[PDB]
Short mmCIF file of C-alpha atoms and ligand atoms in Angstrom, two decimals:
data_model
loop_
_atom_site.label_atom_id
_atom_site.label_comp_id
_atom_site.label_asym_id
_atom_site.label_seq_id
_atom_site.Cartn_x
_atom_site.Cartn_y
_atom_site.Cartn_z
CA UNK B 4 -25.37 -73.91 -45.19
CA UNK B 5 -28.67 -74.90 -46.84
CA UNK B 6 -31.89 -72.95 -47.12
CA UNK B 7 -35.40 -74.25 -47.78
CA UNK B 8 -37.60 -71.87 -49.76
CA UNK B 9 -41.36 -72.45 -50.04
CA UNK B 10 -44.15 -71.07 -52.14
CA UNK B 11 -46.96 -70.42 -49.67
CA UNK B 12 -50.48 -71.27 -50.87
CA UNK B 13 -50.83 -74.93 -51.86
CA UNK B 14 -47.23 -75.68 -50.84
CA UNK B 15 -47.30 -74.90 -47.08
CA UNK B 16 -51.10 -74.85 -46.79
CA UNK B 17 -54.34 -76.31 -48.08
CA UNK B 18 -55.17 -74.24 -51.18
CA UNK B 19 -56.81 -71.10 -49.67
CA UNK B 20 -56.49 -71.95 -45.97
CA UNK B 21 -54.04 -71.13 -43.14
CA UNK B 22 -50.98 -73.36 -42.60
CA UNK B 23 -51.65 -76.53 -40.51
CA UNK B 24 -50.05 -77.47 -37.18
CA UNK B 25 -48.65 -80.52 -39.07
CA UNK B 26 -46.89 -78.23 -41.50
CA UNK B 27 -45.79 -75.88 -38.70
CA UNK B 28 -44.32 -78.83 -36.77
CA UNK B 29 -42.37 -80.18 -39.74
CA UNK B 30 -40.75 -76.75 -40.40
CA UNK B 31 -39.78 -76.38 -36.72
CA UNK B 32 -37.93 -79.71 -37.04
CA UNK B 33 -36.14 -78.63 -40.24
CA UNK B 34 -34.92 -75.47 -38.53
CA UNK B 35 -33.59 -77.23 -35.40
CA UNK B 36 -31.83 -79.65 -37.76
CA UNK B 37 -29.98 -76.53 -39.03
CA UNK B 38 -31.76 -75.55 -42.27
CA UNK B 39 -32.60 -71.95 -42.84
CA UNK B 40 -36.15 -71.34 -43.95
CA UNK B 41 -37.66 -68.85 -46.32
CA UNK B 42 -41.01 -68.09 -47.87
CA UNK B 43 -41.60 -66.52 -51.28
CA UNK B 44 -44.99 -65.76 -52.77
CA UNK B 45 -46.63 -63.44 -55.27
CA UNK B 46 -48.99 -62.03 -52.59
CA UNK B 47 -48.31 -59.18 -50.21
CA UNK B 48 -46.98 -59.40 -46.64
CA UNK B 49 -50.40 -59.06 -44.94
CA UNK B 50 -51.67 -62.00 -47.07
CA UNK B 51 -48.63 -64.18 -46.24
CA UNK B 52 -49.11 -63.30 -42.54
CA UNK B 53 -52.77 -64.36 -42.84
CA UNK B 54 -51.92 -67.81 -44.15
CA UNK B 55 -48.75 -68.43 -42.14
CA UNK B 56 -49.83 -66.78 -38.87
CA UNK B 57 -48.84 -63.60 -37.07
CA UNK B 58 -45.39 -64.88 -35.94
CA UNK B 59 -44.35 -65.27 -39.62
CA UNK B 60 -41.17 -63.14 -39.21
CA UNK B 61 -40.09 -65.21 -36.22
CA UNK B 62 -40.95 -68.57 -37.84
CA UNK B 63 -38.99 -67.98 -41.05
CA UNK B 64 -35.42 -66.70 -41.51
CA UNK B 65 -36.35 -64.98 -44.81
CA UNK B 66 -39.75 -63.69 -45.98
CA UNK B 67 -40.10 -62.53 -49.59
CA UNK B 68 -43.45 -60.81 -50.27
CA UNK B 69 -44.52 -59.93 -53.84
CA UNK B 70 -41.77 -62.28 -55.01
CA UNK B 71 -39.23 -60.37 -52.87
CA UNK B 72 -40.15 -56.77 -53.76
CA UNK B 73 -40.63 -56.53 -49.98
CA UNK B 74 -38.03 -58.70 -48.25
CA UNK B 75 -37.30 -59.55 -44.58
CA UNK B 76 -34.31 -61.33 -43.05
CA UNK B 77 -34.12 -62.26 -39.36
CA UNK B 78 -37.36 -60.34 -38.74
CA UNK B 79 -36.09 -57.08 -40.24
CA UNK B 80 -36.79 -55.46 -43.63
CA UNK B 81 -33.81 -55.29 -45.97
CA UNK B 82 -35.33 -54.64 -49.40
CA UNK B 83 -38.31 -52.69 -50.75
CA UNK B 84 -38.76 -52.10 -54.49
CA UNK B 85 -41.82 -51.13 -56.60
CA UNK B 86 -43.01 -50.84 -60.19
CA UNK B 87 -43.01 -47.00 -60.06
CA UNK B 88 -39.30 -46.98 -59.04
CA UNK B 89 -38.30 -49.51 -61.67
CA UNK B 90 -40.16 -47.73 -64.48
CA UNK B 91 -40.35 -44.13 -63.36
CA UNK B 92 -43.36 -41.85 -63.70
CA UNK B 93 -42.98 -40.93 -67.38
CA UNK B 94 -42.91 -44.58 -68.51
CA UNK B 95 -45.78 -45.50 -66.18
CA UNK B 96 -48.11 -42.81 -67.54
CA UNK B 97 -47.16 -43.66 -71.17
CA UNK B 98 -47.93 -47.37 -70.64
CA UNK B 99 -51.25 -46.71 -68.88
CA UNK B 100 -52.37 -44.14 -71.51
CA UNK B 101 -51.76 -46.70 -74.24
CA UNK B 102 -53.70 -49.36 -72.20
CA UNK B 103 -56.63 -46.98 -71.79
CA UNK B 104 -56.80 -46.10 -75.51
CA UNK B 105 -56.54 -49.77 -76.46
CA UNK B 106 -59.34 -50.76 -74.06
CA UNK B 107 -61.58 -47.82 -75.05
CA UNK B 108 -61.28 -48.88 -78.73
CA UNK B 109 -62.33 -52.50 -78.10
CA UNK B 110 -65.48 -53.79 -79.74
CA UNK B 111 -66.59 -56.16 -77.04
CA UNK B 112 -70.11 -56.60 -75.65
CA UNK B 113 -69.53 -55.83 -71.94
CA UNK B 114 -67.32 -53.31 -70.12
CA UNK B 115 -67.75 -52.05 -66.57
CA UNK B 116 -64.90 -50.53 -64.55
CA UNK B 117 -61.37 -50.91 -63.18
CA UNK B 118 -59.66 -51.65 -66.43
CA UNK B 119 -56.09 -50.73 -65.41
CA UNK B 120 -55.05 -51.34 -61.82
CA UNK B 121 -51.65 -49.97 -60.75
CA UNK B 122 -50.22 -52.23 -58.05
CA UNK B 123 -46.94 -52.14 -56.18
CA UNK B 124 -45.35 -54.80 -58.42
CA UNK B 125 -47.41 -54.83 -61.62
CA UNK B 126 -50.10 -53.48 -63.80
CA UNK B 127 -53.23 -55.64 -63.89
CA UNK B 128 -55.17 -55.01 -67.11
CA UNK B 129 -58.79 -56.05 -67.82
CA UNK B 130 -60.68 -55.41 -71.10
CA UNK B 131 -64.05 -55.88 -69.37
CA UNK B 132 -62.85 -54.37 -66.11
CA UNK B 133 -62.76 -56.02 -62.69
CA UNK B 134 -65.93 -54.32 -61.43
CA UNK B 135 -67.96 -56.98 -63.32
CA UNK B 136 -70.10 -59.72 -61.83
CA UNK B 137 -69.07 -63.39 -61.72
CA UNK B 138 -71.55 -64.27 -64.46
CA UNK B 139 -69.93 -61.53 -66.49
CA UNK B 140 -66.47 -63.01 -65.83
CA UNK B 141 -67.74 -66.41 -67.06
CA UNK B 142 -69.17 -64.81 -70.20
CA UNK B 143 -66.00 -62.82 -70.93
CA UNK B 144 -63.73 -65.81 -70.42
CA UNK B 145 -65.74 -67.71 -73.04
CA UNK B 146 -65.74 -64.66 -75.37
CA UNK B 147 -61.98 -64.40 -74.84
CA UNK B 148 -61.25 -68.08 -75.76
CA UNK B 149 -62.97 -67.49 -79.10
CA UNK B 150 -61.69 -63.94 -79.87
CA UNK B 151 -58.31 -63.86 -77.99
CA UNK B 152 -58.89 -60.31 -76.75
CA UNK B 153 -56.29 -60.49 -73.97
CA UNK B 154 -53.57 -62.06 -76.19
CA UNK B 155 -54.13 -59.34 -78.86
CA UNK B 156 -53.71 -56.58 -76.29
CA UNK B 157 -50.47 -58.17 -74.97
CA UNK B 158 -49.10 -58.35 -78.55
CA UNK B 159 -50.00 -54.68 -79.00
CA UNK B 160 -48.27 -53.58 -75.78
CA UNK B 161 -45.19 -55.75 -76.41
CA UNK B 162 -44.78 -54.17 -79.87
CA UNK B 163 -45.41 -50.62 -78.62
CA UNK B 164 -43.02 -50.76 -75.62
CA UNK B 165 -40.27 -53.30 -76.27
CA UNK B 166 -37.76 -51.00 -74.52
CA UNK B 167 -39.78 -51.22 -71.27
CA UNK B 168 -38.63 -54.87 -70.86
CA UNK B 169 -41.92 -56.13 -69.43
CA UNK B 170 -43.20 -59.65 -69.01
CA UNK B 171 -46.90 -60.44 -69.50
CA UNK B 172 -49.06 -63.10 -67.81
CA UNK B 173 -52.66 -64.16 -68.55
CA UNK B 174 -54.76 -64.37 -65.40
CA UNK B 175 -57.88 -66.24 -64.46
CA UNK B 176 -60.81 -65.09 -66.52
CA UNK B 177 -60.71 -61.37 -67.14
CA UNK B 178 -57.15 -60.02 -66.85
CA UNK B 179 -53.43 -60.11 -67.45
CA UNK B 180 -50.48 -58.98 -65.37
CA UNK B 181 -47.64 -56.83 -66.70
CA UNK B 182 -44.37 -56.63 -64.74
CA UNK B 183 -40.67 -56.06 -65.40
CA UNK B 184 -38.90 -59.10 -66.76
CA UNK B 185 -37.41 -61.04 -63.84
CA UNK B 186 -40.03 -59.97 -61.31
CA UNK B 187 -41.22 -63.57 -60.93
CA UNK B 188 -40.15 -65.68 -57.90
CA UNK B 189 -36.52 -65.78 -59.11
CA UNK B 190 -36.36 -62.15 -58.02
CA UNK B 191 -35.67 -63.38 -54.45
CA UNK B 192 -32.67 -65.53 -55.42
CA UNK B 193 -30.27 -62.55 -55.57
CA UNK B 194 -30.89 -62.16 -51.82
CA UNK B 195 -29.83 -65.75 -50.81
CA UNK B 196 -27.50 -66.72 -53.69
CA UNK B 197 -24.24 -65.75 -51.98
CA UNK B 198 -25.11 -67.16 -48.50
CA UNK B 199 -26.10 -70.80 -49.21
CA UNK B 200 -24.45 -73.75 -50.96
CA UNK B 201 -27.82 -75.45 -51.37
CA UNK B 202 -31.18 -73.81 -52.03
CA UNK B 203 -34.19 -76.11 -52.10
CA UNK B 204 -37.35 -74.71 -53.61
CA UNK B 205 -40.81 -76.19 -52.93
CA UNK B 206 -43.76 -75.29 -55.08
CA UNK B 207 -46.96 -76.75 -56.38
CA UNK B 208 -47.42 -74.75 -59.58
CA UNK B 209 -44.11 -75.67 -61.23
CA UNK B 210 -45.15 -76.45 -64.83
CA UNK B 211 -44.86 -73.95 -67.69
CA UNK B 212 -47.21 -71.01 -66.96
CA UNK B 213 -47.39 -71.69 -63.23
CA UNK B 214 -45.97 -68.96 -60.99
CA UNK B 215 -43.49 -71.47 -59.45
CA UNK B 216 -42.00 -72.37 -62.85
CA UNK B 217 -39.02 -70.04 -63.19
CA UNK B 218 -37.80 -70.48 -59.65
CA UNK B 219 -38.16 -74.28 -59.91
CA UNK B 220 -36.37 -74.49 -63.25
CA UNK B 221 -33.64 -72.05 -62.17
CA UNK B 222 -30.26 -73.82 -61.96
CA UNK B 223 -29.52 -72.26 -58.52
CA UNK B 224 -32.40 -74.20 -57.02
CA UNK B 225 -33.10 -77.81 -56.03
CA UNK B 226 -36.75 -77.81 -57.08
CA UNK B 227 -39.42 -79.97 -55.50
CA UNK B 228 -42.83 -80.09 -57.16
CA UNK B 229 -45.51 -80.83 -54.60
CA UNK B 230 -49.18 -81.65 -55.08
CA UNK B 231 -50.03 -80.72 -51.47
CA UNK B 232 -48.43 -79.49 -48.25
CA UNK B 233 -48.63 -83.12 -47.03
CA UNK B 234 -46.03 -83.92 -49.74
CA UNK B 235 -43.94 -81.00 -48.54
CA UNK B 236 -43.92 -82.61 -45.09
CA UNK B 237 -42.97 -85.97 -46.54
CA UNK B 238 -40.05 -84.50 -48.50
CA UNK B 239 -38.89 -82.65 -45.36
CA UNK B 240 -39.19 -85.73 -43.14
CA UNK B 241 -37.08 -87.59 -45.71
CA UNK B 242 -34.52 -84.76 -45.84
CA UNK B 243 -34.36 -84.93 -42.04
CA UNK B 244 -34.43 -88.75 -41.70
CA UNK B 245 -31.23 -88.91 -43.81
CA UNK O 4 -98.02 -41.21 -38.19
CA UNK O 5 -94.57 -39.56 -38.16
CA UNK O 6 -91.23 -40.96 -39.23
CA UNK O 7 -87.75 -39.79 -38.27
CA UNK O 8 -85.13 -40.24 -40.98
CA UNK O 9 -81.42 -39.86 -40.21
CA UNK O 10 -78.26 -39.55 -42.22
CA UNK O 11 -75.82 -41.91 -40.53
CA UNK O 12 -72.22 -40.68 -40.25
CA UNK O 13 -71.95 -37.40 -38.34
CA UNK O 14 -75.70 -37.35 -37.64
CA UNK O 15 -76.15 -40.53 -35.54
CA UNK O 16 -72.44 -41.01 -34.80
CA UNK O 17 -69.14 -39.27 -34.20
CA UNK O 18 -67.73 -38.63 -37.69
CA UNK O 19 -66.14 -42.03 -38.58
CA UNK O 20 -67.07 -43.99 -35.44
CA UNK O 21 -69.85 -46.39 -34.39
CA UNK O 22 -73.10 -44.99 -32.92
CA UNK O 23 -72.95 -44.22 -29.14
CA UNK O 24 -75.08 -45.77 -26.40
CA UNK O 25 -76.36 -42.20 -25.80
CA UNK O 26 -77.59 -42.02 -29.37
CA UNK O 27 -78.96 -45.59 -29.21
CA UNK O 28 -80.88 -44.74 -26.02
CA UNK O 29 -82.44 -41.58 -27.45
CA UNK O 30 -83.73 -43.47 -30.54
CA UNK O 31 -85.22 -46.25 -28.37
CA UNK O 32 -87.19 -43.53 -26.55
CA UNK O 33 -88.42 -41.96 -29.81
CA UNK O 34 -89.69 -45.33 -31.01
CA UNK O 35 -91.58 -46.17 -27.79
CA UNK O 36 -93.11 -42.69 -28.01
CA UNK O 37 -94.54 -43.92 -31.35
CA UNK O 38 -92.25 -42.47 -34.04
CA UNK O 39 -91.11 -44.70 -36.83
CA UNK O 40 -87.40 -44.58 -37.50
CA UNK O 41 -85.40 -44.79 -40.67
CA UNK O 42 -81.82 -44.46 -41.78
CA UNK O 43 -80.63 -43.24 -45.17
CA UNK O 44 -77.01 -42.95 -46.24
CA UNK O 45 -74.87 -42.97 -49.37
CA UNK O 46 -72.87 -45.98 -48.12
CA UNK O 47 -73.72 -49.64 -48.54
CA UNK O 48 -75.57 -51.89 -46.09
CA UNK O 49 -72.43 -53.53 -44.62
CA UNK O 50 -71.04 -50.03 -43.87
CA UNK O 51 -74.30 -48.86 -42.23
CA UNK O 52 -74.33 -52.10 -40.18
CA UNK O 53 -70.74 -51.36 -39.09
CA UNK O 54 -71.60 -47.93 -37.73
CA UNK O 55 -75.06 -48.69 -36.37
CA UNK O 56 -74.39 -52.22 -35.07
CA UNK O 57 -75.44 -55.68 -36.17
CA UNK O 58 -79.09 -55.35 -35.00
CA UNK O 59 -79.59 -52.44 -37.47
CA UNK O 60 -82.66 -54.04 -39.15
CA UNK O 61 -84.29 -54.58 -35.76
CA UNK O 62 -83.42 -51.11 -34.43
CA UNK O 63 -84.83 -49.17 -37.39
CA UNK O 64 -88.20 -49.55 -39.13
CA UNK O 65 -86.68 -48.53 -42.51
CA UNK O 66 -83.07 -48.85 -43.72
CA UNK O 67 -82.12 -47.17 -47.00
CA UNK O 68 -78.60 -48.13 -48.18
CA UNK O 69 -76.96 -46.34 -51.13
CA UNK O 70 -79.64 -43.68 -50.73
CA UNK O 71 -82.35 -46.38 -50.94
CA UNK O 72 -81.09 -48.39 -53.94
CA UNK O 73 -81.17 -51.23 -51.38
CA UNK O 74 -84.12 -50.72 -49.04
CA UNK O 75 -85.44 -52.63 -45.99
CA UNK O 76 -88.74 -52.24 -44.13
CA UNK O 77 -89.53 -54.14 -40.92
CA UNK O 78 -86.32 -56.14 -41.34
CA UNK O 79 -87.14 -57.34 -44.86
CA UNK O 80 -85.84 -56.17 -48.25
CA UNK O 81 -88.42 -54.48 -50.46
CA UNK O 82 -86.36 -52.65 -53.09
CA UNK O 83 -83.10 -53.29 -54.94
CA UNK O 84 -82.06 -51.12 -57.91
CA UNK O 85 -78.67 -50.54 -59.61
CA UNK O 86 -76.93 -48.31 -62.15
CA UNK O 87 -76.72 -51.15 -64.73
CA UNK O 88 -80.53 -51.64 -64.59
CA UNK O 89 -81.27 -47.94 -64.82
CA UNK O 90 -78.91 -47.36 -67.75
CA UNK O 91 -78.67 -50.73 -69.45
CA UNK O 92 -75.50 -52.30 -70.83
CA UNK O 93 -75.27 -50.37 -74.10
CA UNK O 94 -75.40 -46.97 -72.36
CA UNK O 95 -72.97 -48.12 -69.65
CA UNK O 96 -70.30 -49.23 -72.13
CA UNK O 97 -70.75 -46.04 -74.23
CA UNK O 98 -70.30 -43.80 -71.16
CA UNK O 99 -67.24 -45.71 -69.88
CA UNK O 100 -65.59 -45.78 -73.34
CA UNK O 101 -65.94 -42.01 -73.56
CA UNK O 102 -64.49 -41.65 -69.99
CA UNK O 103 -61.51 -43.81 -70.93
CA UNK O 104 -60.74 -41.86 -74.12
CA UNK O 105 -61.08 -38.56 -72.27
CA UNK O 106 -58.73 -39.71 -69.47
CA UNK O 107 -56.20 -41.25 -71.87
CA UNK O 108 -56.00 -37.91 -73.77
CA UNK O 109 -55.28 -35.82 -70.64
CA UNK O 110 -52.01 -33.95 -70.42
CA UNK O 111 -51.46 -34.21 -66.70
CA UNK O 112 -48.23 -35.09 -64.90
CA UNK O 113 -49.31 -38.19 -62.92
CA UNK O 114 -51.61 -41.12 -63.73
CA UNK O 115 -51.64 -44.52 -62.06
CA UNK O 116 -54.66 -46.84 -62.14
CA UNK O 117 -58.38 -47.30 -61.44
CA UNK O 118 -59.62 -44.41 -63.45
CA UNK O 119 -63.24 -45.56 -63.92
CA UNK O 120 -64.84 -47.55 -61.13
CA UNK O 121 -68.27 -49.07 -61.84
CA UNK O 122 -70.23 -49.26 -58.60
CA UNK O 123 -73.74 -50.42 -57.84
CA UNK O 124 -75.13 -46.86 -57.80
CA UNK O 125 -72.63 -44.73 -59.71
CA UNK O 126 -69.55 -44.34 -61.77
CA UNK O 127 -66.59 -42.93 -59.86
CA UNK O 128 -64.16 -41.26 -62.26
CA UNK O 129 -60.54 -40.24 -61.49
CA UNK O 130 -58.15 -38.53 -63.95
CA UNK O 131 -55.10 -39.61 -61.91
CA UNK O 132 -56.68 -42.89 -60.86
CA UNK O 133 -57.39 -44.09 -57.32
CA UNK O 134 -54.35 -46.37 -57.15
CA UNK O 135 -52.22 -43.27 -56.31
CA UNK O 136 -50.50 -42.49 -53.04
CA UNK O 137 -51.76 -39.89 -50.56
CA UNK O 138 -48.96 -37.50 -51.48
CA UNK O 139 -50.09 -37.94 -55.07
CA UNK O 140 -53.69 -37.13 -54.09
CA UNK O 141 -52.46 -33.93 -52.40
CA UNK O 142 -50.47 -32.96 -55.50
CA UNK O 143 -53.38 -33.69 -57.87
CA UNK O 144 -55.87 -31.76 -55.77
CA UNK O 145 -53.62 -28.70 -55.97
CA UNK O 146 -53.08 -29.25 -59.74
CA UNK O 147 -56.85 -29.58 -60.11
CA UNK O 148 -57.66 -26.27 -58.30
CA UNK O 149 -55.42 -24.46 -60.79
CA UNK O 150 -56.36 -26.38 -64.00
CA UNK O 151 -59.97 -27.54 -63.25
CA UNK O 152 -59.36 -30.98 -64.76
CA UNK O 153 -62.36 -32.63 -63.08
CA UNK O 154 -64.80 -29.79 -63.95
CA UNK O 155 -63.68 -29.90 -67.64
CA UNK O 156 -64.31 -33.64 -67.81
CA UNK O 157 -67.81 -33.23 -66.27
CA UNK O 158 -68.63 -30.52 -68.86
CA UNK O 159 -67.45 -32.88 -71.60
CA UNK O 160 -69.58 -35.81 -70.37
CA UNK O 161 -72.65 -33.63 -69.76
CA UNK O 162 -72.44 -32.32 -73.35
CA UNK O 163 -71.79 -35.76 -74.85
CA UNK O 164 -74.60 -37.61 -73.02
CA UNK O 165 -77.38 -35.17 -72.11
CA UNK O 166 -79.98 -37.88 -72.86
CA UNK O 167 -78.48 -40.11 -70.13
CA UNK O 168 -79.90 -37.73 -67.47
CA UNK O 169 -76.95 -38.03 -65.10
CA UNK O 170 -75.96 -35.88 -62.15
CA UNK O 171 -72.29 -35.20 -61.39
CA UNK O 172 -70.57 -34.61 -58.03
CA UNK O 173 -66.98 -33.56 -57.27
CA UNK O 174 -65.39 -35.74 -54.60
CA UNK O 175 -62.57 -35.25 -52.17
CA UNK O 176 -59.29 -34.82 -53.98
CA UNK O 177 -59.08 -37.03 -57.02
CA UNK O 178 -62.55 -37.98 -58.29
CA UNK O 179 -66.13 -37.27 -59.21
CA UNK O 180 -69.28 -39.35 -58.97
CA UNK O 181 -71.76 -39.78 -61.84
CA UNK O 182 -75.26 -41.09 -61.09
CA UNK O 183 -78.78 -40.80 -62.51
CA UNK O 184 -80.51 -37.58 -61.60
CA UNK O 185 -82.54 -38.14 -58.43
CA UNK O 186 -80.27 -40.83 -57.02
CA UNK O 187 -79.37 -38.60 -54.05
CA UNK O 188 -81.01 -39.13 -50.63
CA UNK O 189 -84.42 -38.00 -51.94
CA UNK O 190 -84.52 -41.34 -53.73
CA UNK O 191 -85.81 -42.91 -50.48
CA UNK O 192 -88.76 -40.51 -50.12
CA UNK O 193 -90.92 -42.39 -52.65
CA UNK O 194 -90.84 -45.32 -50.20
CA UNK O 195 -92.26 -43.40 -47.15
CA UNK O 196 -94.19 -40.55 -48.84
CA UNK O 197 -97.61 -42.23 -48.81
CA UNK O 198 -97.36 -43.71 -45.26
CA UNK O 199 -96.49 -40.67 -43.07
CA UNK O 200 -98.05 -37.25 -42.49
CA UNK O 201 -94.76 -35.95 -41.09
CA UNK O 202 -91.25 -36.87 -42.19
CA UNK O 203 -88.40 -35.36 -40.18
CA UNK O 204 -84.98 -35.51 -41.74
CA UNK O 205 -81.76 -35.13 -39.72
CA UNK O 206 -78.47 -34.46 -41.41
CA UNK O 207 -75.21 -32.71 -40.81
CA UNK O 208 -74.15 -31.94 -44.38
CA UNK O 209 -77.22 -29.92 -45.40
CA UNK O 210 -75.70 -26.92 -47.21
CA UNK O 211 -75.41 -26.69 -51.00
CA UNK O 212 -73.02 -29.45 -52.19
CA UNK O 213 -73.44 -31.58 -49.08
CA UNK O 214 -75.01 -35.00 -49.63
CA UNK O 215 -77.84 -34.13 -47.17
CA UNK O 216 -78.86 -31.02 -49.15
CA UNK O 217 -81.60 -32.26 -51.46
CA UNK O 218 -83.37 -34.34 -48.85
CA UNK O 219 -83.21 -31.47 -46.33
CA UNK O 220 -84.48 -28.88 -48.79
CA UNK O 221 -87.19 -31.20 -50.15
CA UNK O 222 -90.66 -29.88 -49.27
CA UNK O 223 -91.81 -33.35 -48.07
CA UNK O 224 -89.32 -33.19 -45.23
CA UNK O 225 -88.99 -31.34 -41.91
CA UNK O 226 -85.24 -30.84 -42.10
CA UNK O 227 -82.97 -30.56 -39.09
CA UNK O 228 -79.36 -29.53 -39.65
CA UNK O 229 -77.15 -30.95 -36.93
CA UNK O 230 -73.51 -30.26 -36.16
CA UNK O 231 -73.16 -33.49 -34.14
CA UNK O 232 -75.14 -36.51 -32.98
CA UNK O 233 -75.35 -34.78 -29.57
CA UNK O 234 -77.56 -32.16 -31.30
CA UNK O 235 -79.62 -34.96 -32.81
CA UNK O 236 -80.26 -36.21 -29.27
CA UNK O 237 -81.18 -32.74 -28.09
CA UNK O 238 -83.68 -32.25 -30.93
CA UNK O 239 -85.18 -35.68 -30.19
CA UNK O 240 -85.41 -35.06 -26.44
CA UNK O 241 -87.22 -31.81 -27.26
CA UNK O 242 -89.55 -33.57 -29.71
CA UNK O 243 -90.29 -36.10 -26.95
CA UNK O 244 -90.51 -33.61 -24.04
CA UNK O 245 -93.36 -31.83 -25.88
CL1 CL V 1 -59.64 -48.01 -64.98
MG1 MG V 2 -48.96 -72.06 -55.03
MG1 MG V 3 -73.14 -37.13 -42.84
#
C-alpha cells in the first residue's frame, strides 16, 4: 500500500503548461502497477484541472487543491476548509484592519489598489497593491530589497497577533502570503497518513523557502526533488522497473 | 452628417448577452443609409468586443471604451487616457491612503479584502471589500441602507479632497466608484462634436443615477430612452423609413 504524491506545476508539467502525454503515460503505468496516485498543489481545483486535464478526478486517486483545503478521494469531495472557518470573523476583521492601518501609514513612493486580498486559504498583502503595472512591480521589488518594506510589515503582524498562529511567506515582487501555521503542503498528509505504508512525494521546489519544502522534509514522506517532469518520469520508470 | 451613438448592454443587446442578428441587421441598414455609428460604454474594450462580436472595429465607425478613455475611429486608436495620468501619482497615493485609513477605522461587522481597487478609469471603494461572499454582499447592502456607510465615506472624501474634482457613484451592493468629474459617457462627445450636425444617443439607463443620464440629457445629443434593443431597432427602422 504505497501512494505517489506530486506537486503539479514543474513536477508533472513543463513550468506553466499542461501535463504531457509522456507524463500521462508514465502515471497510467504506475497505477496499473498498483500505486495509488495523488496530486497536491497550492493552486485551486480549476487551475489543477487546467494543467492536468478535465479527467483529473478520474486520473488521480486523491486530489488536494489549495494544499488540501479542498480534497477529493476516488472522485468525490471529502474535505473543505477555509481561512474564515479557521480564524472566525472577529479575528479576520482585526487582522485586516491592522494590515490596512499599517499600509496606509507607509511612506513609500507608489501605491495603487488591492492591498489586502482575502482568499479561501490565505491573506495576500501588498504594500503597493496588486493593481500596479509590471514596471511598477519591478520598481517596488528594487525599493523593497533596499528598504525591506515587506519584512517589516511581517514583523509587525507577527508581534501584534502571535495568538493567531499564522505563517508568513514573501511572494514574487510585491506581496506576502499569510496563512495558518501548517497550511502548507503537509496539510494533505493527515488525509493519507493512516492508509499507506509508503508515501512518495515529488516536487521541484524542495529547498528552504520553496513551497515543496515542508512536505519533502516531512518524515512521513519519501521525498524526490525533481528539476523537470522528465525526471519525474525517470524516477517512476525506475520505481516500476524494479 | 449624422452619427448614431449607442450604449451597449441593454441598448444593443439583451441585458447580459451578445448582440442579436436582428440588432446587427438593423445597424447595417442604418450605415448603408449613410449614418455613422458609434458605441460608448463604461466597460473595457475586451468586454465590448465580447458583446458586440470580434469585428466590432469594422462594424462601428467609432468605439468608445470606458466612456471614451480608450477610443477608436475607423478601426484605429486615437485616444487613450487613464486615472493615473489625470491625477498623477502624488494625488493617487494621497487619495488611496485616506480611503484605507477611513475603511480601517470603520466599526462594521464584516470586512474581508479588496477594499480599494485602482482601475484604469476610477477607484472602486468597498467598506466590506469585494472578496466577500454573495450572502455577505446581501447582508452588507441591508446594513448599508440602515447605517449609510457608503454615503458617509463619500461625504468624507469629498470634504477632504475638493480640489481633486472627483465625481462619486454608489454601486450595486458593496461599493462606490470615484472618477474625475466629466468621466461619464459625455466624455466621448468631445471626439464627435465638431464632425456631426446631429448626434443621436440611445440608452436604456437614462434616468437620474443611470450611467446613460448625462449623455442623454446633454444638449449636444438627441437622446432616445429604450427599454430593450428591440425598441432600438424600432426607432432605427423609423429613422430609416422616413
Ligand atoms: Cl485593498
Ligand atoms: Mg512546483
Ligand atoms: Mg445599459
